[PDB]
Design a protein around this ligand. Sequence first.
Ligand code: HEM
Length: 154
Amino acid sequence: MVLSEGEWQLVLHVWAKVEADVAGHGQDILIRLFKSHPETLEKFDRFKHLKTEAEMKASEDLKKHGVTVLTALGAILKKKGHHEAELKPLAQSHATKHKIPIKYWEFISEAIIHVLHSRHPGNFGADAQGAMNKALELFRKDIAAKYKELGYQG
Ligand code: HEM
């Protein structure tokens, strides 16, 4: 797939607001993911023990990881489709070190959109949301193709 420049512009406009508070958004997103789909929490040996939202909010380690997650994602979105090199080490660790099924990538995609919609309704209308969804689909399908090449696909 190919996004048009207009769709990229809606994606990076919203993303510019996210970057005003990278730590805050990464924590909201990860927490939303773990509440909505608790099974994903089990893949993180580091966070496995957190039992409540309050424990998650309080974890400095979790907020650090969220900053790490959104920074890697930001650098990919800013490539506007040209993200081959950024993608490979990411797919390799998640496929063969962390053992992450493809399905969980959709789950975090869902969380991202929920959070942007709650925090940026003015900059996250129907059109901007369709653009963000297209960008994350594009991303997921490229991750899925790399999984396959790496011998995982699952
Ligand atoms: C937008 C999607 C995501 C991005 C950009 C992302 C990025 C990263 C980065 C940059 C790291 C650290 C270096 C590495 O191991 O490659 C990491 C580690 C990790 N990721 Fe992801 N991640 C994403 C989605 C996921 C998903 C869907 C899961 C699990 C449901 C996941 C599980 C993990 C685990 C288990 C670690 C290691 C945590 C630790 O340090 O103990 N990631 N992620």
